[PDB]
Amino acid sequence: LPLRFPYGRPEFLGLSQDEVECSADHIARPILILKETRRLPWATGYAEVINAGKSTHNEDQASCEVLTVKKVSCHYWSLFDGHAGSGAAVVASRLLQHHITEQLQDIVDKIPHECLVIGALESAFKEMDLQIERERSSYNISGGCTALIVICLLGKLYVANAGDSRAIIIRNGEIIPMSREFTPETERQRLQLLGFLKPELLGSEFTHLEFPRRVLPKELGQRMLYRDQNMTGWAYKKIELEDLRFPLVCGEGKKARVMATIGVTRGLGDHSLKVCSSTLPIKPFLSCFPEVRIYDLSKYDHGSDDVLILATDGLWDVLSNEEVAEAITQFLPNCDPDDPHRYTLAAQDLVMRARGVLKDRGWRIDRLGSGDDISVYVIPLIHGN
Length: 385
Ligand SMILES: [Mn+2]
Ligand SMILES: [Mn+2]
Ligand SMILES: [Mn+2]
Fold this sequence. Notes:
Helix content is 22%, strand content 23%. It is an alpha+beta fold. It has two domains: 11-180 and 287-384, PPM-type phosphatase domain (Phosphatase 2c, domain 1); 188-263, no CATH class. A hairpin with a 2-residue loop joins β6 and β7. α2 packs across α3 (113-135). Residues 164, 264, 313, 317 line the site of one manganese (II) ion.
C-alpha cells in the first residue's frame, strides 16, 4: 500500500529532501535544531537526534502550530515516539491537531470548563486512533507511536500524555511534573483486570496472575507469592497448572512488559501488533486515552528561564529530572534573556548532554549515551503571562 504521508522530519525544521538523508547518519548523529531565521510560537526551542542505528529512520515525530477553533487561537505542541515503523508517528503528527480542533469546536462555549477541554482531548486521541484503524486498510501506517501533546487554551496549559515521554516544568529551579509515564508497572492492575474478565485475550498462553520469578513446573503445587488484579501487596497460593503459563505482566521498571513484547501501554497505532511467535493480538491491552494535567499560567509570574520541557524516552532514559533542571538553569544565563534562539540552544544542550560523544566505538555522556531518537521541546512560559 502507499504511505498516507511521506516520511520526514518535523516541518518547522524546513529541511530539503537531501538534508533529511544527511541527518539520518547513524555515525555522525547530527543534532538538528531550528534555524535562526525560523521562529516558533512563544520562541519555543526544538532539538533532535536520530538513533544510534537501531532503525534506519528517525521514528520520532513532532509538530506545533497555533490553531483556530471556530464554529479560536489555541497553541499546540506535539511529540510522538514511533516504534515498529514510522507510519503512526507521521500520521498522528499531521492529523491529531485537526482531531483536536474538531473536538474543541463542539465545546467552544454544572461541569467545570476544564472538564470539557479535557474531554475534548481524550475524545480527540480516540478519533486519531480509529482514523488510523480505518485508513490502515488503504494506506501504509506502520507500527504505533506514543503521543504527548500540550495545548494552550485561555491561559491554561493542558498536557495530555499517552506513552512514556515526559513533560516537566522548571519554575525557579523547582521541577513540576506535568505528566506520568504509562508502563506495565504503573498500569499493571488495569491489565490484570482485563486479562481476568476477558480471558480469551490471554488465550491459554498467559496467566493474568503475577509471580516474583519464572514459575517452573517443578514447583507445581508449592506455595508461592502472587499478585492479583485487586492486590497491591503479595500473598501465597498453591501453584495450580494454569499458573505455569507466562505472566501477562512481568518485569521491573524499564524491564516491565505486557506479554513479553512491549514496555509502554498507551499510545496510538499498533492495531495489528501481535505477540512474538503467536496469533494473540496486543491492542486490547492498550489505550489511546491520555492523562491530562493542567497548569494555570496566571497564578504565577514567569521569569525568562521558566520553561516547559517536552522530550521523548530518548532523553529521559539517560538523564534525570534533576539532571535536566540543573543543565537548563545552568545554560540559560549564558544567553541574553531577550535573545529568541535562547531556548533552541537550551534544547540543543539537553540533546547534546544525552546523545553523548562517540568514544572508542560507543556513545558516552563514563556513563553511556542514548541510542534512541531524541526530540526536545523547550517552551518559554514567560510568553503566557
Ligand atoms: Mn521510537
Ligand atoms: Mn521507553
Ligand atoms: Mn523512543
